[PDB]
Amino acid sequence: VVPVDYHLLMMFTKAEHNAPLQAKARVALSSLLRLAKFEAHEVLNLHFVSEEASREVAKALLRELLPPAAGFKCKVIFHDVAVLTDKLFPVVEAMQKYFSAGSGTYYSDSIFFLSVAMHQIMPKEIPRIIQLDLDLKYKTNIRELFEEFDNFLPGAVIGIAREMQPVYRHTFWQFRHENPKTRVGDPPPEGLPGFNSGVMLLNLEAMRQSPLYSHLLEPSWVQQLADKYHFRGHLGDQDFFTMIGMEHPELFHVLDCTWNRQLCTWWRDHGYSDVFQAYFRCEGHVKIYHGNCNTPIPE
Amino acid sequence: QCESNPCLNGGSCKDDINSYECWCPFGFEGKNCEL
Ligand SMILES: *[C@@H]1O[C@H](CO)[C@@H](O)[C@H](O[C@H]2OC[C@@H](O)[C@H](O)[C@H]2O)[C@H]1O
């Protein structure tokens, strides 16, 4: 039988002596694996980005959870955060000053941009990869998420869900001020609230092959758009995709909110009580919970 | 990481070194929009 590979990637760094992170990793990976199902010839590839101490922590967790109940073939791959950092930096350097905490261009911020240049980092054999946060809880078989790649329209390179707080209403304030009629930062269904990076379907082939996407990576394009939008962030990849998502929504296949149901309400209590609901509303059968800003996930 | 700047102006992190004013979202006052 012809073997078929599925690729997931998760960030797992600074995990040693960090019980809160290990608990999240535990919640994410246990649900993922309990609920995952794959055909006989299919193999699930789990890529972890870690320094050496966190690699040992992840292994100890992983042996406790593998092999999976459903008995499918599962391969674990680790990538050195320091190796990836150096590979990302030339590509990613110029965007750091706009999207990193705070100023300006530090090596330690580079990895938070991994997804934007993932097609240049992963071997060309990998055509697609799903990057996932470790503060998730899977409520369905992750194999089902992969079929969303099929719903990508011509020219789209990334599958991503909307940001469910008005953080981007706040971020785009000055652009909003200068453009009263803009949908930039407005809530759904007609506004553009920006994106959340918790679940991202990164089509590496479409990313490599897009003339538009490649141009938006160039220092002067990053700079031009950040100026047009008066954009300052500290959320990295999320902030970059959000920004280019305002200029060029064609590039993104918007996932339904149930694929990344965020639970953080921090912005509700910081000046957005009125409009919060319009952003935060998500209805339908939840597929993935995202316990962002350390928000406990319900059981 | 940093804590988000509750101010509408300046950098993304609160206590942006290059900021002196703090324009708060409606309903809030203070150097960090506390009350
Ligand atoms: C502003 O700072 C606060 C305090 O550190 C963060 O919790 C906020 O992040 C949260 O809201 C926006 C979501 O996109 C993040 O996933 C979530 O942690 C930050 O915007």
Bridge partners (DSSP) of residue A43 are A5, A73
Rounded to whole angstroms, how far apart are CA atoms A203 and A20? Answer: 31
Bridge partners (DSSP) of residue A254 are A160
* Other CB atoms within 10 A of residue B17 CB: 10
Instruction: Report CA-CA distances (Å) from A76 to A9, A110, A222.
Output: 10, 24, 35
Q: What share of chain B is helix, strand, coil (3-state, %, to 5)?
A: 0, 5, 95
Resolution of this deposited model, Å: 2.4
Give domain limits for chain B.
1-35
With contact defined as beta carbons under 8 Å apart, do A235 and A162 qualify? Answer: no
Give domain limits for chain A.
1-299
A100 is in an annotated binding site: no
Please identify which residue in the block is written with the tokens 């071997």: A123
With contact defined as beta carbons under 8 Å apart, do A139 and A288 qualify? Answer: yes
Q: Which two tokens stand for residue A260?
A: 């990344």
How was this structure determined? It was done by X-ray
A11 is in an annotated binding site: yes
Helices A237-247/A219-228 angle, 10° precision: 70
Non-local (6+) Cβ contacts of A179 within 8 A are none
Please identify which residue in the block is written with the tokens 């699930």: A44
Residue having the nearest C-alpha atom to atom 9 of ligand 1 = A293
**Is B25 close to A103, i.e. CB distance below 8 A?**
no
Bridge partners (DSSP) of residue A42 are A4
Please give the CATH number for the structural domain made up of B1-35.
2.10.25.10
Rounded to whole angstroms, how far apart are CA atoms A126 and A9? Answer: 12
Non-local (6+) Cβ contacts of A289 within 8 A are A136, A137, A139, A261, A263, A297, A298
Ligand 1 site: residues with CB under 6 angstroms? Answer: A 163, 165, 167, 196, 264, 266-267, 292-293; B 3-4
Q: Give residue B23's identity as a one-letter amino acid code.
A: W
**A186: Cα separation from own chain's centroid:** 21
Helices A237-247/A81-99 angle, 10° precision: 50
Please identify which residue in the block is written with the tokens 């050195």: A80
